[PDB]
PDB file of N, CA and C and ligand atoms in Angstrom:
ATOM      1  N   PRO G   1     -13.462   4.198  -3.249  1.00  0.00           N
ATOM      2  CA  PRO G   1     -12.525   3.315  -2.996  1.00  0.00           C
ATOM      3  C   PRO G   1     -11.115   3.778  -2.003  1.00  0.00           C
ATOM      4  N   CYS G   2     -11.646   5.428  -1.431  1.00  0.00           N
ATOM      5  CA  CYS G   2     -10.930   6.220  -0.802  1.00  0.00           C
ATOM      6  C   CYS G   2     -11.413   6.231   0.412  1.00  0.00           C
ATOM      7  N   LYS G   3     -10.826   5.750   1.740  1.00  0.00           N
ATOM      8  CA  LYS G   3     -11.498   5.843   2.754  1.00  0.00           C
ATOM      9  C   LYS G   3     -10.714   6.385   3.791  1.00  0.00           C
ATOM     10  N   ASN G   4     -10.829   7.473   4.550  1.00  0.00           N
ATOM     11  CA  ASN G   4      -9.876   8.164   5.595  1.00  0.00           C
ATOM     12  C   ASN G   4     -10.623   8.224   6.531  1.00  0.00           C
ATOM     13  N   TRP G   5     -10.406   7.467   7.517  1.00  0.00           N
ATOM     14  CA  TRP G   5     -10.518   7.145   8.707  1.00  0.00           C
ATOM     15  C   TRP G   5     -10.623   8.086   9.958  1.00  0.00           C
ATOM     16  N   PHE G   6      -9.803   9.339   9.599  1.00  0.00           N
ATOM     17  CA  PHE G   6      -8.953  10.438  10.842  1.00  0.00           C
ATOM     18  C   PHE G   6      -8.852  11.648   9.892  1.00  0.00           C
ATOM     19  N   UNK G   7      -8.974  11.360   8.301  1.00  0.00           N
ATOM     20  CA  UNK G   7      -8.699  12.829   7.784  1.00  0.00           C
ATOM     21  C   UNK G   7      -7.729  12.546   6.664  1.00  0.00           C
ATOM     22  N   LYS G   8      -6.782  13.624   6.799  1.00  0.00           N
ATOM     23  CA  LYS G   8      -5.610  14.113   5.754  1.00  0.00           C
ATOM     24  C   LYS G   8      -4.640  13.045   6.554  1.00  0.00           C
ATOM     25  N   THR G   9      -4.523  12.648   7.604  1.00  0.00           N
ATOM     26  CA  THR G   9      -3.554  11.891   8.653  1.00  0.00           C
ATOM     27  C   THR G   9      -3.218  10.377   7.356  1.00  0.00           C
ATOM     28  N   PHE G  10      -4.328   9.884   7.233  1.00  0.00           N
ATOM     29  CA  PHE G  10      -4.530   8.997   6.567  1.00  0.00           C
ATOM     30  C   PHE G  10      -5.321   8.740   5.498  1.00  0.00           C
ATOM     31  N   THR G  11      -4.497   8.479   3.898  1.00  0.00           N
ATOM     32  CA  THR G  11      -5.294   8.353   2.930  1.00  0.00           C
ATOM     33  C   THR G  11      -5.147   6.827   2.430  1.00  0.00           C
ATOM     34  N   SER G  12      -6.462   6.066   2.362  1.00  0.00           N
ATOM     35  CA  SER G  12      -6.446   4.885   1.875  1.00  0.00           C
ATOM     36  C   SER G  12      -7.296   4.508   0.429  1.00  0.00           C
ATOM     37  N   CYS G  13      -6.614   4.342  -0.550  1.00  0.00           N
ATOM     38  CA  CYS G  13      -7.474   4.462  -2.049  1.00  0.00           C
ATOM     39  C   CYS G  13      -6.898   3.124  -2.304  1.00  0.00           C
ATOM     40  N   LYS G  14      -7.901   2.200  -2.737  1.00  0.00           N
ATOM     41  CA  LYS G  14      -7.260   0.643  -2.654  1.00  0.00           C
ATOM     42  C   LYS G  14      -8.594   0.065  -4.033  1.00  0.00           C
TER      43      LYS G  14
HETATM   44  C1  OCA S   1     -14.735   4.253  -2.724  1.00  0.00           C
HETATM   45  O1  OCA S   1     -15.762   4.712  -3.070  1.00  0.00           O
HETATM   46  C2  OCA S   1     -15.000   2.840  -1.884  1.00  0.00           C
HETATM   47  C3  OCA S   1     -14.448   3.750  -0.483  1.00  0.00           C
HETATM   48  C4  OCA S   1     -15.018   2.737   0.637  1.00  0.00           C
HETATM   49  C5  OCA S   1     -13.598   2.530   1.595  1.00  0.00           C
HETATM   50  C6  OCA S   1     -12.713   1.680   1.557  1.00  0.00           C
HETATM   51  C7  OCA S   1     -11.569   0.311   2.348  1.00  0.00           C
HETATM   52  C8  OCA S   1     -13.230  -0.542   2.740  1.00  0.00           C
END
């Protein structure tokens, strides 16, 4: 459920 498109700059867990 966690996707990082760019790396550690964008964290999305939903
Ligand atoms: C968790 O393992 C699921 C991650 C898939 C991307 C989440 C946003 C669609």
